[PDB]
Amino acid sequence: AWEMGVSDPRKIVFSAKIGLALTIVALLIFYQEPNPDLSRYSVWAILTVVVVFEFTIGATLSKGFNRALGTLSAGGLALGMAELSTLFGDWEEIFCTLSIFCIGFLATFMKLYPSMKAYEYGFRVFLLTYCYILISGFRTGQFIEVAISRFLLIALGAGVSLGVNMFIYPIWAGEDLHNLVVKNFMNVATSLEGCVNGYLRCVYKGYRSAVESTSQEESLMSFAIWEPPHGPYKSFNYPWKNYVKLSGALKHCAFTVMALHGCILSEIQAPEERRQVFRQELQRVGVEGAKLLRELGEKVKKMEKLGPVDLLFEVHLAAEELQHKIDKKSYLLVNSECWEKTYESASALSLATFASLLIEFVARLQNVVDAFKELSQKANFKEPE
Amino acid sequence: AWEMGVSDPRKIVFSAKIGLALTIVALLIFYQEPNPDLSRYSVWAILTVVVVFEFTIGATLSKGFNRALGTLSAGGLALGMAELSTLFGDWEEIFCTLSIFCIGFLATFMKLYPSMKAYEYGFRVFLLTYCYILISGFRTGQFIEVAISRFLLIALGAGVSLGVNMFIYPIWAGEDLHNLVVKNFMNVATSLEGCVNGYLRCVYKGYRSAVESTSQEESLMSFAIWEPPHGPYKSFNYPWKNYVKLSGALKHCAFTVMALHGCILSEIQAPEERRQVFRQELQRVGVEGAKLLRELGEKVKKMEKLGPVDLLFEVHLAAEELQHKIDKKSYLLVNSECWEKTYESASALSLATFASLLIEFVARLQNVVDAFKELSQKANFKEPE
Ligand SMILES: CCCCCCCCCCCCCCCCCC(=O)OC[C@H](COP(=O)(O)O)OC(=O)CCCCCCCCCCCCCCCCC
Ligand SMILES: CC(C)CCC[C@@H](C)[C@H]1CC[C@H]2[C@@H]3CC=C4C[C@@H](OC(=O)CCC(=O)O)CC[C@]4(C)[C@H]3CC[C@]12C
Numbered sequence: 001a002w003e004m005g006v007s008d009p010r011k012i013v014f015s016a017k018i019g020l021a022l023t024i025v026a027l028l029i030f031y032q033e034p035n036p037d038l039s040r041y042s043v044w045a046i047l048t049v050v051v052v053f054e055f056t057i058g059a060t061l062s063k064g065f066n067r068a069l070g071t072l073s074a075g076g077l078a079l080g081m082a083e084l085s086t087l088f089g090d091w092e093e094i095f096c097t098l099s100i101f102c103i104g105f106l107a108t109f110m111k112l113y114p115s116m117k118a119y120e121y122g123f124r125v126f127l128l129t130y131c132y133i134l135i136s137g138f139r140t141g142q143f144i145e146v147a148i149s150r151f152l153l154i155a156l157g158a159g160v161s162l163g164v165n166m167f168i169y170p171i172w173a174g175e176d177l178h179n180l181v182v183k184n185f186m187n188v189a190t191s192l193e194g195c196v197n198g199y200l201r202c203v204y205k206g207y208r209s210a211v212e213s214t215s216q217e218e219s220l221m222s223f224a225i226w227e228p229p230h231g232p233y234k235s236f237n238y239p240w241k242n243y244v245k246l247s248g249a250l251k252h253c254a255f256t257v258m259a260l261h262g263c264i265l266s267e268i269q270a271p272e273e274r275r276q277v278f279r280q281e282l283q284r285v286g287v288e289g290a291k292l293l294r295e296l297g298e299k300v301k302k303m304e305k306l307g308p309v310d311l312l313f314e315v316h317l318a319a320e321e322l323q324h325k326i327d328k329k330s331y332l333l334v335n336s337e338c339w340e341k342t343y344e345s346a347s348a349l350s351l352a353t354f355a356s357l358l359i360e361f362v363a364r365l366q367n368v369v370d371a372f373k374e375l376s377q378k379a380n381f382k383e384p385e
Numbered sequence: 386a387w388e389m390g391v392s393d394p395r396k397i398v399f400s401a402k403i404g405l406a407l408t409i410v411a412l413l414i415f416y417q418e419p420n421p422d423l424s425r426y427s428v429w430a431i432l433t434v435v436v437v438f439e440f441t442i443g444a445t446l447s448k449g450f451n452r453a454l455g456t457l458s459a460g461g462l463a464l465g466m467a468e469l470s471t472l473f474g475d476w477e478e479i480f481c482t483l484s485i486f487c488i489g490f491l492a493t494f495m496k497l498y499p500s501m502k503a504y505e506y507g508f509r510v511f512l513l514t515y516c517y518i519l520i521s522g523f524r525t526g527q528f529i530e531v532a533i534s535r536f537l538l539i540a541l542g543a544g545v546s547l548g549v550n551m552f553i554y555p556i557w558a559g560e561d562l563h564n565l566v567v568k569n570f571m572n573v574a575t576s577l578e579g580c581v582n583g584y585l586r587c588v589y590k591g592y593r594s595a596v597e598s599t600s601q602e603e604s605l606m607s608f609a610i611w612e613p614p615h616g617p618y619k620s621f622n623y624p625w626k627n628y629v630k631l632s633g634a635l636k637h638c639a640f641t642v643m644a645l646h647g648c649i650l651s652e653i654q655a656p657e658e659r660r661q662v663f664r665q666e667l668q669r670v671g672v673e674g675a676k677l678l679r680e681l682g683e684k685v686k687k688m689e690k691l692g693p694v695d696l697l698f699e700v701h702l703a704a705e706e707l708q709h710k711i712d713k714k715s716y717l718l719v720n721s722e723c724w725e726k727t728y729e730s731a732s733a734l735s736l737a738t739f740a741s742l743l744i745e746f747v748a749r750l751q752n753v754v755d756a757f758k759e760l761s762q763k764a765n766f767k768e769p770e
């Protein structure tokens with residue numbers, strides 16, 4: 001309630017816009033001279049403002065196109081089918097009912113298509129429009145006449161909804177993917193630091209969102225291609241795919257962070273004393289990785305280019321130091337007496353796993369800087385301050 | 386198309402049932418004596434059969450209840466608000482429009498609630514019903530009269546849709562979670578075998594579905610609690626939660642299989658010659674794990690109890706043999722000259738990671754047999770043949 005409103009004020013603005021549109025339409029309908037058909041068809045303009053408003057502007061311009069195509073096709077097909085059914089006599093009702101049967105069967109079958117999963121609304125609109133335009137009219141000429149009135153009412157409703165949506169505090173879909181990309185870096189860095197600290201002690205939301213939020217960026221990219229230039233994004237063809245590429249490159253490391261976190265919840269764990277021998281190198285590598293990830297995130301937020309100095313010098317050095325430390329004290333991981341209990345060796349061998357996973361992270365942190373450079377070049381960025 | 390139909394014939398039956406219901410309703414409406422209001426309100430029975438049909442029976446009995454509650458509450462609130470607005474004079478329209486504003490604002494705000502995410506249809510039905518019942522009627526007594534007719538038509542449509550749905554080849558939601566649980570075991574076993582073979586060579590769908598399909602079982606469990614006894618499930622309170630518990634227990638191992646698969650796609654990999662020294666033990670452990678998983682899956686499919694002999698004897702032995710083999714030849718994983726290049730040791734240390742992950746799998750395969758025993762006891766099973 002109040003906590004939700006204070007946390008995010010965009011929802012309040014959305015609700016206010018919906019209320020304002022509904023109030024405008026209701027006032028326009030009410031303050032009209034009485035008409036015989038002004039009380040029977042005036043409810044068609046208030047049911048169109050509640051079925052056209054969407055959060056983002058791209059989600060409002062991309063779904064309206066489909067919904068239209070569907071409505072127009074269904075209306076045309078229904079009119080043609082009625083005109084063809086008038087051909088025969090004394091048997092029209094049977095043809096109409098068999099047309100309803102075939103149409104419903106085909107609509108349901110095509111709506112159950114794996115690939116066509118997010119377009120259910122279009123098929124349902126098609127089916128409903130066909131049924132209504134045939135049953136309600138029960139005639140060809142009689143119906144076509146009232147189509148004019150019903151289209152004017154539905155277009156008044158859709159025009160008022162579009163006007164109000166695209167003019168009072170618009171919410172663009174291109175400014176959401178950017179914030180998601182920026183937040184992913186911080187989440188991954190926090191998860192890495194938490195995992196390292198938890199292991200060296202006497203971490204889920206970050207990588208969970210980094211991995212799970214893989215289908216929530218494709219939708220935003222699909223919505224953002226319908227919007228016009230607005231502010232910093234000064235172009236008609238903005239490379240919105242490079243953001244998805246960078247997000248996938250970061251998810252690749254997020255998988256390794258997931259594995260590191262899973263290491264903690266294992267049933268076979270090494271003794272604390274052995275863990276407390278590689279503390280400094282592990283903590284240094286963790287801090288350097290987190291710092292580099294946060295630096296990349298901040299650079300993405302401000303839309304700036306990478307400077308001259310390399311960013312992975314300290315991570316690439318801390319990895320070498322950790323490797324050397326593991327090499328020196330590598331007799332605590334594997335016993336040497338039996339060379340040519342099981343639980344003891346199983347618990348002692350987990351530190352090599354942890355070190356190898358950390359090294360894999362540090363060896364997978366370069367694809368995200370290649371992706372960042374590609375993005376910073378495709379979408380013209382500002383030179384570093 | 387034809388491939389979809391041959392792969393799954395349930396969709397064809399669903400489409401046929403939808404078509405049959407629509408045809409019955411259309412014939413009933415058409416073959417009726419002409420009435421002044423039989424052509425203006427007869428389209429309200431064909432728009433209710435297309436908005437009430439759902440795949441499963443539980444999904445049809447669980448959503449209808451909410452949709453009803455919402456419709457009834459909205460109608461009552463609208464009637465009360467109209468009766469209260471009649472109190473004043475010459476200013477009713479303003480009160481009605483401010484009621485529309487407040488109702489729309491509250492509806493949108495409560496529909497944007499994180500927790501209330503899957504109940505959007507109920508809120509939209511509430512809002513649409515309120516707006517229609519106020520604007521269309523523009524009166525209290527006049528509207529209440531026609532409510533009888535509109536309710537009879539909507540109940541004829543919903544009754545024909547429910548009859549047709551629950552009598553001609555029903556599709557129960559309790560027979561889908563069972564098949565998902567059975568399929569998960571086979572998928573995980575196949576993924577494990579594929580990963581092992583790929584590593585020992587000169588694997589994604591299984592664990593992906595095991596992990597990803599975590600929210601598709603809660604929905605089935607929620608739908609299955611509305612259905613009555615049918616066939617083998619002879620009880621009014623069936624333990625549908627134990628299936629989810631078993632699925633989560635299997636997902637726990639699926640995470641380790643995910644880590645094993647990720648090991649293959651790493652940038653630092655051990656030499657093939659060193660890999661070819663532990664081939665037999667790894668292959669034996671993989672085969673035993675796959676066989677045990679398939680045995681548990683088959684036992685779940687047939688609804689049978691675990692016999693006397695233990696199931697993890699051979700896995701628990703192959704793990705010991707692998708541990709001994711790693712102990713004997715443990716000088717190929719860590720160098721001994723530097724005791725007190727980096728890439729060489731980094732690549733050589735990955736075999737310990739692979740072995741440790743395999744041992745973790747074999748040490749996490751017991752929670753799934755505890756969960757299976759608990760399920761086999763809570764839901765009375767048949768004694769083994
Ligand atoms: C040449 C080209 C010609 C072009 C031809 C153009 C054709 C124009 C076609 C016009 C028709 C198109 C209509 C489409 C509009 C969308 C409609 C729609 O989809 O539905 C939304 C929606 C669609 O499904 P959704 O997207 O999942 O929400 O369905 C509904 O929600 C409507 C549900 C109907 C229930 C309304 C009940 C209100 C009255 C209840 C009274 C109960 C009183 C009880 C009292 C109790 C207390 C005593
Ligand atoms: C006539 C051609 C040359 C231009 C198009 C003019 C209108 C006839 C179009 C523009 C927007 C269309 C509307 C777009 C959105 C909707 C809401 C749509 O709602 C749903 O799809 C149900 C909700 C859901 O599925 O989530 C019902 C049809 C309708 C009113 C469409 C009817 C046809 C409209 C008014």
Ligand SMILES: CC(C)CCC[C@@H](C)[C@H]1CC[C@H]2[C@@H]3CC=C4C[C@@H](OC(=O)CCC(=O)O)CC[C@]4(C)[C@H]3CC[C@]12C
Binds near residue numbers: 433456457506536
């Ligand atoms: C009156 C009390 C004592 C018993 C209930 C009798 C009827 C008035 C109930 C039973 C089923 C209800 C219907 C259940 C399902 C729907 C479809 C529903 O569709 C949607 O919610 C839109 C689609 C979607 O959101 O996915 C619109 C209202 C309606 C017809 C409901 C209106 C009220 C109905 C007819």
